[PDB]
Design a protein around this ligand. Structure first.
Ligand SMILES: Nc1ncnc2c1ncn2[C@@H]1O[C@H](COP(=O)(O)OP(=O)(O)OP(O)(O)=S)[C@@H](O)[C@H]1O
Ligand SMILES: Nc1ncnc2c1ncn2[C@@H]1O[C@H](COP(=O)(O)OP(=O)(O)OP(O)(O)=S)[C@@H](O)[C@H]1O
Ligand SMILES: Nc1ncnc2c1ncn2[C@@H]1O[C@H](COP(=O)(O)OP(=O)(O)O)[C@@H](O)[C@H]1O
Ligand SMILES: [Mg+2]
Ligand SMILES: [Mg+2]
Ligand SMILES: [Mg+2]
Lengths: 96, 443, 434, 41, 426, 70
């Protein structure tokens, strides 16, 4: 709520897909426009949705899987990142 | 919607911060012990912790017990339920006495569920709805503006239908609820371009709203426990909320509602605001009603019950033995009794003056003294009723003040109980006796 | 042409800033009671008080019901008067308390004054004027729709807004139709074809209505009268249609129901809103409960509670009893039939018995009302019987005397006819002896 | 001299920004042989 | 934070394993013999063997009968059905007193059953009527898609829920209930402003199957087999708005329901949990209710009904010359076992007042508590119990936490007892 | 009453004679233990026959008092 009031767009990083589903349900109840990136995303679809998030300014929250970040992709359009849960490997958070 | 009624002159119990009754405040005069006890019960209700207490108000007629109840209700104010019923109201034909008492008890417990809603408010700039003739596809966009921002929304089918129904135009300031979907026309921003029909019906302009176009607001839904029970009793119970004919709701419904509301309270979803149930003339209730009251006061979801009685020792209805207050000893054992006393001459005089102020009747000093003497002699309520008739008599005389002669005329025209009894005893042959005999002729 | 028992009671017959005239308005005597009823009527007209009770106390044949009817006539037909007998409260469909409350709210009335501007007339022209499109697009746009209406000694052309096209299509109006269009709402309604085209077709199902008079633009003030009971019943009743609730309502006969306090409070809230808006005015009214002795103690207790309601009418009660036990009680002997708790909340007016001259004047005025002629000796004998047996006995005996006189080809009532009727029709006392 | 006023406009057009038929336009804004003969023999 | 009632401090019977009752446990003080008897009754109920057993809690007013009943309910636990009642509650106007008594009898008998729920949920991808005709619906989820054929009732439910392509639904196969949970997330950005509330696409397979254990009563089965009770179809609406009032259920329906329950138990899918019916103030019952209670107790499937009365040598309601020990006719008394409840001395009254004060979060000084105990002994125990809240309110108004003697005296002068009010009347 | 042997609906000689379907009389043949009879029926009776779902070979029952087909 504070981030949306301030005009910042948040990035949710979690560790397991079930938490992705729970978060999706929560933010769907709260009406936030969003897109989700998961492990099962296709390569072309992954790139296209990354470009969509970078270009579109109407989706406030964007959800990632922390483990899938090992293959990095440009996400310069963000303004704040939220770590729902922590990982044992700090380099994964560093690349996130 | 109200008129000048009997207890319209009291706006509360009139107490200090330490529950010490003022000599005269908020419409109440005297009854210092009674007012202090009523304030203690008021604080007990406002605390919201003590459940199912019973309190009795006893005393002679015209001692202010119903006035005390109205003062308690006014001090409670809104948002705290107050259910005023009479003993005669329980005896119904579609419901049992126990069921009617259960519904009356549950009417006094309120449940508040607070919700946060998003509201769009602004002055319309352009509305545009494009619909194909003989086709179901509709496409529309609107531009709603505020003093600091302006934006365009492309609309779905239901929003288009709602705006078409509401007859929204350019010079309209409207509010949109994103959840409910209702459109409220708050007012107009300018005139309608000087068409023929409706020339000058929009002169009452309203200022353009200011701030963020989409702002969050909180909405509180207050519903009594009985309403929830009626809604969940059957599918047609919602109609029964207005029509009546609720039937005898099965006990399982009430138990499940109790459990669900307790869960809501433990979850913070709902706030429970218990209130006060007030029974006028409780001596009319049957002994079965008193037994049910005895048991139902032990429930955790019960309100605080206050009763009024003036019968002294009298026969309890449904039984053949006299009881100390018209009530069985079982109910008296679990109730605290607050007493009321007769009024002095000065208290009667100031009550009469308060009533005259409320009835907008200007009484001269001598007229007020005569009214006070009459009230002490005959009845407080008799003089209270005589005030307005004296005002009307004065108006007939084309005078703006009530003098002694107007009160004398009102006294002559309208009788008290004692004078009527005397006239009946003197002329008993002219009235029908209990044995059904009367003389109609005068010779 | 009909003659009930109170056709001659036209009013209390008081004078402004004065007292009751000896004979006026059909009333003879009862000066004090008439003055008290006059001050009560003034109080009711003031429309500033609620829950005011007066008791008409007196013997039989003393004018109590006549006084209540005089109050009703003096207040006029606009003030809602609700006559009632105490026996009527004992229903079988609902409790007594519900019936009493329904009568209470039937006594309160509401007056709604609405002014509406309307254009009416036969449709003569229907042309939309093209205008430049703000959004371009090479489409055909209309800025106004022109409707020409012709009326009796009047005709005009209107440049209405383009929105009218929907209402015109929905009401399938045409040239020659006479229509009803509200000035501020924008809706239209056709009442039929013009009578000038009734000859164009020999048969046609539609109804041809006469052309409306006056100018096309007419401003009308419509006044409607409703009671709180009417609003409560209308809100508690289904609309009536093809929906399933109305179907089960058709199946199950509508019985009286305990209208909940929530519905009544909603009705009060909407009424208060519209009163504040300036469209509605509240009229308290009078609730007359004759034979209050018949009411039970439960009804009396509920009256005790209901008189304190912030919105309640003026209740007039009448009782011909002395010291009698209150119904539903075993040892409560109270003045009249009213228990002492309710008597403390009301004001009593006495109704005195009559003298020979008053009875004679009443008899002669009643005979005048019944379009009958009586001789002086016959009138004296009739008054003698009225003072001997009963006033109502003679008042009723007037008509059979007239029938006997008419059978004897005579246009006047004579002592012979009076004695013949006396022998034919016995009173209560002579029959009790027999 | 009025500052702001609200106008209303109604238009009929086809998707390729083309106007419709004039008679059809006027009909839509507002909204030979025998077919049955009977005779008793 | 928490509310307090008459029996909020009663947490159980406070009986040890051997059955002897401690002097002060579970919020009880004294009444050792009655607690032991009620523990024996609780063991009998837990045995789940006998039917129709009845006991009577006989004692004077303010002696601890309703508290004992609530303690029995607490000891048995929330699994078992415990139906509270009053003698005045059986005088219904829709159905006769006998039917109400039988319904309460069958409401106190519990049944626990196992049911398998077939559930479908997903985003709608097709709505094709087969032509009142079946509808062919295609449900998609994150793990797969599925196409189903639905009966006309489900089609009517879907039609009245305004379900279109892209909507997410929830069809329960067993009951035929359709809920439109919202619009799919993939269409959230289609329009910038519409009333639709969007939901994510469901996870897992469309066809889900779960096993839930649900507790029902025999009265629930009787009502289910007697009148229509639910549904989103107009047929169900008309069926239930027709014949709305209660009806006198026949013995045949109860016998058939008993046969059904016996079949369920025999298959092992259900277990029976007999419970307790508590009828307080039994003296309000008429002679007919007692007479039918004589026959109802002889039924082979009946709960352990517990009765409470506070009257002695009182005549039975309805009769005019039958003087009975507790307002209960001798025919029913012979069917009952009487548990006598004894008055309280001063020390136990003092301890009860102390514990009640502790429960309501009040602080009472020892001398003030002694005065409260002695005035409860003089007038009434419940009178002393109700004086605590006004005393606390008075103390708070004086900016003082603990209750003092002066506050108690002020509360006594404000609120009176029955004897004092009667004396004032005299 | 009898067993249906024929059911031959006939239309009007001219299409303009009636409205819509323009159904004229229907011819039905019933068989009994003593012989057969060919009946000429109103279109209302044909509608009743269709409502009761009567085919060739079914035993039917027509009341001339009321026009009811069973
Ligand atoms: N003062 C009066 N002047 C003229 N007619 C009168 C007068 N008082 C009574 N009447 C008539 O006398 C008849 C009987 O009187 P009512 O007033 O109708 O009865 P009542 O006096 O109310 O007695 P009860 O209570 O009805 S038995 C009616 O026809 C009245 O119109
Ligand atoms: N032995 C006890 N120990 C603790 N609290 C008790 C004890 N006995 C009674 N109480 C409490 O004191 C109050 C007495 O009420 P009850 O126990 O219902 O007495 P009762 O026998 O039900 O009187 P009746 O018949 O209902 S009028 C209740 O609040 C009880 O919780
Ligand atoms: N203490 C008081 N202060 C102000 N007004 C009072 C007081 N006591 C009584 N009254 C007035 O006198 C009348 C008494 O009415 P009510 O309270 O109904 O009498 P009762 O106590 O017999 O029910 C009321 O109209 C009330 O306005
Ligand atoms: Mg009162
Ligand atoms: Mg009368
Ligand atoms: Mg008890």
């Amino acid at each position: 709520q504070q981030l949306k009031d301030n005009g910042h767009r948040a990035l949710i990083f979690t560790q397991m897909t079930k938490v992705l589903d729970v978060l999706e349900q929560f933010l769907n109840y709260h009406g936030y426009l969003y897109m989700r990136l998961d492990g099962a995303t296709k390569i072309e679809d992954r790139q296209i949705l990354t470009e969509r998030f970078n270009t579109d300014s109407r989706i406030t929250v964007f959800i990632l899987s922390s483990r899938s970040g090992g293959l990095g992709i440009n996400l310069t359009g963000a303004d704040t990142v939220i770590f729902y849960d922590s990982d044992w490997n700090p380099a994964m958070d560093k690349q996130c | 919607l109200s008129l000048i009624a009997a207890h319209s002159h009291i706006t509360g119990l009139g107490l200090d911060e330490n529950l010490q009754p003022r000599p005269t405040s908020e419409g109440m005069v005297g009854q210092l012990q009674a007012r202090r006890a009523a304030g203690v019960i008021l604080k007990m209700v406002q605390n919201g912790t003590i459940a199912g207490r019973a309190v009795l108000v006893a005393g002679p007629p015209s001692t202010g017990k119903t006035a005390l109840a109205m003062g308690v209700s006014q001090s409670l104010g809104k948002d705290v339920p107050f259910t005023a019923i009479a003993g005669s109201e329980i005896f119904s034909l579609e419901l049992s006495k126990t069921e009617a008492l259960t519904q009356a008890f549950r009417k006094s417990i309120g449940i508040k569920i607070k919700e946060e809603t998003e509201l769009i408010e602004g002055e319309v700039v352009e509305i545009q709805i494009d619909r194909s003739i003989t086709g179901g596809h509709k496409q529309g966009k609107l531009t709603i503006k505020t003093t600091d921002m302006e934006t365009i929304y492309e609309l779905g089918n239901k929003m288009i239908d709602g705006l078409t129904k509401e007859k929204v135009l350019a010079g309209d300031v409207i509010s949109i609820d994103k959840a409910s979907g209702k459109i409220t026309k708050l007012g107009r921003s300018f005139a309608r371009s000087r068409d023929y029909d409706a020339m000058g019906a929009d002169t009452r302009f309203v200022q353009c709203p200011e701030g963020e176009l989409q702002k969050r607001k909180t909405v509180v839904h207050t519903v009594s426990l009985h309403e929830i029970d009626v809604i969940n009793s059957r599918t047609q119970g919602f109609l029964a909320l207005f029509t009546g004919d609720t039937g005898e709701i099965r006990s399982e419904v009430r138990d499940q509602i109790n459990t669900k509301v307790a869960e809501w309270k433990e979850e913070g979803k709902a706030e429970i605001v218990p209130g006060v149930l007030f029974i006028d003339e409780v001596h009319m209730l049957d002994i079965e009603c008193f037994s049910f009251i005895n048991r139902a006061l032990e429930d955790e979801f019960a309100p605080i019950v206050m009763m009024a009685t003036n019968r002294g020792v009298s026969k309890t209805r449904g039984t053949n033995y006299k009881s100390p207050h018209g009530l069985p000893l079982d109910l008296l054992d679990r109730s605290i009794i607050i007493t009321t006393k007769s009024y002095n001459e000065q208290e009667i005089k100031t009550i009469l003056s308060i009533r005259a102020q409320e009835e907008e009747v200007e009484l001269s000093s001598d007229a007020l003294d005569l009214l006070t003497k009459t009230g002490v002699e005959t009845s407080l309520r008799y003089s209270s009723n005589l005030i307005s008739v004296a005002q009307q008599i004065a108006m007939k005389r084309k005078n703006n003040t009530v003098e002694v002669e107007d009160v004398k005329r009102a006294y002559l025209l309208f009788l008290d109980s004692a004078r009527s009894v005397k006239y009946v005893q003197e002329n008993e042959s002219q009235y029908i006796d209990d044995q059904g005999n009367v003389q109609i002729s005068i010779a | 042409t009909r003659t009930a028992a109170h056709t001659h009671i036209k009013g209390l017959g008081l004078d402004e800033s004065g007292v009751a005239k000896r004979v006026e308005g059909g009333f003879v005597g009862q000066i004090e009671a008439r003055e008290a009823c006059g001050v009560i009527v003034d109080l009711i007209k003031a429309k500033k008080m609620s829950g005011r009770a007066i008791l008409l106390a007196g013997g039989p044949s003393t004018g109590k019901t006549a006084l209540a009817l005089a109050i009703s006539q003096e207040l006029g037909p606009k003030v809602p008067f609700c006559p009632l007998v105490g026996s009527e409260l004992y229903s079988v469909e609902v409790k007594k308390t519900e019936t009493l409350m329904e009568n209470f709210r039937r006594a309160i009335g509401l007056r709604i004054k609405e002014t509406k501007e309307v254009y009416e007339g036969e449709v003569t022209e229907l042309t939309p004027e093209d205008a430049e499109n703000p959004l371009g697009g090479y489409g055909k746009t209309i800025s106004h729709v022109i409707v020409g209406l012709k009326s009796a000694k009047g005709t005009k052309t209107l440049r209405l807004d383009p929105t009218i096209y929907e209402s015109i299509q929905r009401e399938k109006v045409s040239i020659g139709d006479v229509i009803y269009i509200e000035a501020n709402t924008g809706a239209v309604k056709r009442v039929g074809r013009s009578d000038a085209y009734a000859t164009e077709f020999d048969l046609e199902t539609e109804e041809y209505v006469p052309l409306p008079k006056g100018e096309v633009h007419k401003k009308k003030e419509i006044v409607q009268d409703v009671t709180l009971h009417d609003l409560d019943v209308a809100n508690a009743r289904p609309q009536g249609g093809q929906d399933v609730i109305s179907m089960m309502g058709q199946l199950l006969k509508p019985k009286k129901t305990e209208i909940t306090e929530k519905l009544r409070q909603e009705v009060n809230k909407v009424v208060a809103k519209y009163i504040d808006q300036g469209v509605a005015e509240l009229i308290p009214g009078v609730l007359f409960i004759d034979e209050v002795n018949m009411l039970d103690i439960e009804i009396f207790t509920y009256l005790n509670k209901a008189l304190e309601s912030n919105i309640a009418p003026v209740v007039v009660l009448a009782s011909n009893r002395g010291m009698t036990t209150v119904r539903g009680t075993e040892d409560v002997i109270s003045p009249h039939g009213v228990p002492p708790d309710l008597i403390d909340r009301l004001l009593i007016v006495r109704t005195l018995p009559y003298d020979k001259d008053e009875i004679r004047t009443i008899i002669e005025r009643r005979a005048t009302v019944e379009r009958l002629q009586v001789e002086s000796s016959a009138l004296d004998l009739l008054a003698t019987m009225g003072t001997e047996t009963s006033l109502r006995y003679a008042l009723q005996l007037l008509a059979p005397c007239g029938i006997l006189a008419q059978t004897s080809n005579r246009k006047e009532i004579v002592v012979n006819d009076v004695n013949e009727a006396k022998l034919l029709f016995l009173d209560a006392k002579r029959s009790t002896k027999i | 001299p009025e500052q702001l006023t609200s106008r209303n406009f109604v238009t009929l057009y086809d998707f390729p920004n083309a106007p419709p038929n004039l008679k059809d336009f006027n009909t839509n804004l507002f909204g030979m042989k025998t077919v049955f003969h009977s005779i008793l023999p």
